[PDB]
Design a protein around this ligand. Structure first.
Ligand SMILES: *[C@@H]1O[C@H](CO)[C@@H](O[C@@H]2O[C@H](CO)[C@@H](O)[C@H](O)[C@H]2NC(C)=O)[C@H](O)[C@H]1NC(C)=O
Ligand SMILES: *[C@@H]1O[C@H](CO)[C@@H](O[C@@H]2O[C@H](CO)[C@@H](O)[C@H](O)[C@H]2NC(C)=O)[C@H](O)[C@H]1NC(C)=O
Ligand SMILES: *[C@@H]1O[C@H](CO)[C@@H](O[C@@H]2O[C@H](CO)[C@@H](O)[C@H](O)[C@H]2NC(C)=O)[C@H](O)[C@H]1NC(C)=O
Ligand SMILES: *[C@@H]1O[C@H](CO)[C@@H](O[C@@H]2O[C@H](CO)[C@@H](O)[C@H](O)[C@H]2NC(C)=O)[C@H](O)[C@H]1NC(C)=O
Ligand SMILES: *[C@@H]1O[C@H](CO)[C@@H](O[C@@H]2O[C@H](CO)[C@@H](O)[C@H](O)[C@H]2NC(C)=O)[C@H](O)[C@H]1NC(C)=O
Ligand SMILES: *[C@@H]1O[C@H](CO)[C@@H](O)[C@H](O)[C@H]1NC(C)=O
Ligand SMILES: *[C@@H]1O[C@H](CO)[C@@H](O)[C@H](O)[C@H]1NC(C)=O
Ligand SMILES: [Ca+2]
Ligand SMILES: [Ca+2]
Ligand SMILES: [Cl-]
Lengths: 484, 481
């Protein structure tokens, strides 16, 4: 019987030897990468936890599945009842499903799991960061197997920040379980300290002491996550099912720094992705240049279990189809896929800054629907040392060491067009350059077509109103905003 | 045994003889007004259907109960599970609950009804506009009563527009059931035609042929709603329970015209309100000047049944308390209440234009949190003849006959302060006038206090971020605001 394992890092980036970061040690991820096809050009469709996890587990963009923003307490976003998620479809096909760690999506009927240990019935600290607890839960899952195939979803909470919720464990909870007084112990974890002067400062992160300290703490926590991956894989090896299991590792969104999480800039949507098939080792240890999306995961896993996507509608007769594709074929031969999309509406319920993006190879186009208002900052990131430092220096009128300034971070153009082959930092907007008018129109057309195809309620915003029963379906408001 | 009846109009305004409109005939509402206390200064806290209905049925502002916007299909907003609504509390106290018409709120567990005929299990056209069907459902409700008190919620869908959904019935569905071909027949309804030249054109509605036609159609439909009220009251009278029943009539938000629905301007939140207590007829046929809110209805009805609001929390240990008050005391003697609040976030999910308001007597202060972006227009109103006409004339550069222009309707000041005793049209913003700096700060303080008191997640927006463990709790973003 075929099995599947989805390892999901929380706010994880490219901090690994597998992705050529020699400043950090991630031997277990590196080991996995040698048995995997590594993707250099993978992206999430949305840079917000719940929406990203909902899209990943449905194959549908947030504006289609209904997770327009964060799921918990006051934010309270849920996917539509009639949505058919991966786990649901797997269960109906006779596959045993399990989740360990951060779920952060609902409702339960849409995202059901036979075996569940999450924040809903326990501590996300334990089942998300305590890799020993995680390892034992994986062991229990495998011991209680019953001849059915399985799908195991391990959603680490590492390397997510902790500064807002639990500061006593460090900015990235890098102190939790380290053995020191009040921290407790995680027997299977060997803490890895990092010097702030040795960490790699990403181009979009301010080069300041405060930021480097943040990164050092992050590195330590990523190491814990790395060791967690090692333990999990070892449990399958001990149960004798690893060689029958498709393993996938990735992250839900960009790292929690400026221009990262919550942005549709490269840093906010670019994600690590490893795919290891025991049946297709031809391209083990290789790197793929194909442009892929987390919207491809549901299709990939369905393909793995030979389960077809059913024909159904959420509203009316509007039949639902996936825009992603199975990545399995890439495990045999390199494809030429070059296009990926992005869609984000809310993060927190108070943060309404819808963005839509399309990327064709190195060209990225972002549409900021509420561009005239300032880009909103979430409550957790606001208190990060990195942002506090940036805010402090900006307010004092002193050099920030940042590749942008807050003014331009807050107030953006409606359309942002970048060529990352020339301008990887995405600082040279080409949208108003007449030499790129034809390319702009092409990308706009591709984006709009995808929006209609995926029933985006925001498809006419902000210059127009959606009127389905007439033509054109987007009717103009004449609100001093251009239309297309 | 005491009963209560809540009659709720959808997008209803002051089109009635009771409110001194001589151009329309509303004999049944006028009759009700003679047996009730009429409120000249009643307001909804939010000018959007689901949020308004959730707030009305909970006593909590939309930003607290969780209905941030519309409830249906793609908009998909629901109140928090732990919210304790009026109907829930009544049920737990042994009161039989019933709803007939448009519900437009959820989830069911939060808003449960023993007897329910709504859009969720039938046609909103029938149970919302077909007053004969409504009358028979009321009859059925009363015939199946036991020795329990009852609370009956009749949510008319009239006089809501129909232009977007069902244009064949007219702009306001004023043709539905009129007898003509394809319209069907409503035996208990006597259609009332109106000349577009005779209707009263509200100050905030463009004086154009297209708008007057809209109003004429509205008047006809309001008449149907009026006759529906008559039938309902008559059913209680036939069951011999009217004299044991507290009757309340009002509307969920302002009329569907410019500056009305979806706005926190006077036209968008001002609502008609009649309260008839068979035990306190002292002030029957009188007019009250007290400033009241639909947030007062839940407290009022709870008071009527002698049911206390329980002590509980939705999140954490932050206990929930109502900011509204029972209106019952006003039925005996005129009070001095002068303050009312407003809070609106979304309408449609794609319409994010949060507004917060406070009104002290004739002074109204509105805060537009997303002011730099244009005011969004909903899909239903966009295709209205009134707006289409306005848009058309504006685009052609011709006179609109409107007291505003679209540019200023779309792009508003962050703070709008109006004195309606001098400027009822609300066109002279005083917020930037130094003469009103002290008053401005006072109203801002009242507004903010209410926001914190009601756990508003938008309390720091847009210039700051909420950090509860820090001081001040609103931390600055320095985002040019
Ligand atoms: C890490 O760096 C190595 C060495 O520079 C990269 O391997 C090279 O990849 C490119 C092909 O696009 C060429 O420089 C050579 O064909 C490769 N050289 C070797 C020695 O393998 C590799 O691509 C990088 N790894 C990742 C994940 O980006
Ligand atoms: C991580 O989880 C492990 C196992 O779930 C915890 O170790 C257990 O701790 C309990 C009480 O704290 C002991 O009674 C058990 O004997 C331990 N079991 C094992 C297998 O070690 C550990 O406390 C957790 N670490 C932290 C920092 O919370
Ligand atoms: C692990 O899985 C692989 C793939 O299924 C097994 O290798 C296959 O073995 C079969 C015979 O049983 C051959 O016909 C195939 O050609 C093999 N495929 C590949 C890709 O090598 C392997 O035997 C399994 N067991 C171990 C210990 O690796
Ligand atoms: C309908 O119109 C009448 C007459 O204008 C209003 O009654 C007047 O109210 C004002 C202000 O309260 C008093 O100063 C006058 O003495 C009243 N005149 C009369 C003849 O009664 C009445 O308030 C209006 N009704 C409504 C509901 O607005
Ligand atoms: C209608 O209801 C009122 C009030 O419930 C009745 O009048 C009350 O009668 C009770 C006892 O019969 C007295 O204690 C109250 O003082 C009365 N209230 C008032 C305001 O008069 C009245 O009898 C009822 N009418 C009918 C026909 O039954
Ligand atoms: C920012 O400034 C505040 C107040 O001046 C200070 O207390 C804090 O330490 C500073 N934080 C950072 C990260 O620089
Ligand atoms: C607005 O203009 C369009 C196109 O000229 C026209 O067809 C339509 O009838 C106009 N709408 C109104 C309400 O006059
Ligand atoms: Ca995340
Ligand atoms: Ca309404
Ligand atoms: Cl909830």
């Amino acid at each position: 019987p075929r099995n599947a394992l989805l390892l999901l890092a929380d706010d994880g980036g490219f901090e690994s030897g597998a992705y050529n970061n020699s400043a950090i040690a991630t031997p277990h991820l590196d080991a996995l990468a040698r048995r995997s096809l590594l993707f250099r050009n993978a992206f999430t469709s949305v840079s917000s936890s719940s929406p990203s996890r909902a899209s990943l587990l449905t194959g549908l963009p947030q504006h289609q599945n209904g997770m327009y923003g964060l799921h918990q307490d006051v934010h309270h976003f849920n996917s539509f009842d009639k949505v058919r998620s991966l786990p649901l479809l797997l269960s109906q096909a006779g596959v045993r499903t399990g989740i360990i760690g951060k779920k952060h999506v609902g409702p339960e009927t849409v995202y059901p799991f036979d075996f569940a240990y999450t924040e809903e019935n326990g501590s996300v600290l334990q089942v998300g960061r305590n890799i020993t607890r995680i390892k034992l839960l994986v062991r229990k899952f495998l011991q209680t197997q019953d001849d059915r195939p399985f799908f195991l979803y391990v959603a680490f909470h590492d390397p997510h920040r902790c500064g807002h919720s639990q500061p006593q464990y460090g900015t990235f909870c890098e102190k939790f379980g380290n053995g020191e007084s009040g921290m407790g112990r995680i027997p299977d974890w060997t803490p890895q300290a990092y010097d702030p002067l040795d960490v790699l400062v990403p181009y979009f992160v301010p080069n300041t002491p405060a930021a480097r300290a943040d990164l050092a703490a992050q590195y330590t926590t990523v190491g814990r996550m790395d060791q967690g991956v090692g333990l999990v894989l070892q449990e399958l090896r001990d149960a004798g099912v690893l060689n029958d299991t498709l393993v996938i590792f990735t992250s839900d969104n960009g790292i929690p720094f400026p221009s990262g999480r919550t942005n549709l800039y490269w840093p906010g949507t670019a994600e690590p992705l490893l795919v290891s098939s025991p049946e297709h080792p031809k391209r083990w240890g290789q790197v793929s240049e194909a442009y892929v999306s987390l919207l491809d995961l549901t299709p990939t896993i369905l393909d793995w279990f030979s389960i077809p996507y059913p024909s159904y509608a959420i509203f009316g007769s509007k039949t639902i189809h996936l825009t992603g594709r199975s990545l399995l074929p890439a495990l045999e031969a390199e494809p030429l896929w070059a296009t990926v999309f992005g869609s984000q509406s809310h993060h927190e319920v108070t943060m309404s800054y819808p963005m839509r993006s399309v990327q064709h190879r190195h060209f990225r186009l972002v549409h900021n629907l509420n561009f005239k208002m300032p880009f909103p900052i979430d409550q957790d990131f606001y208190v990060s040392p990195t942002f506090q430092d940036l805010l402090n220096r900006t307010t004092a009128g002193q050099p920030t060491g940042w590749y942008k300034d807050l003014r331009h971070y807050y107030y953006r153009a409606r359309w942002e067009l970048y060529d990352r082959s020339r301008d990887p930092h995405e600082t040279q907007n080409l949208a108003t350059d007449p030499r790129f008018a034809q390319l702009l129109e092409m990308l706009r057309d591709q984006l709009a077509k995808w929006q209609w195809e995926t029933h985006d309620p925001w498809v006419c915003a902000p210059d127009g109103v959606l009127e389905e029963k007439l033509s054109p379906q987007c009717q103009p408001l004449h609100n001093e905003l251009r239309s297309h």
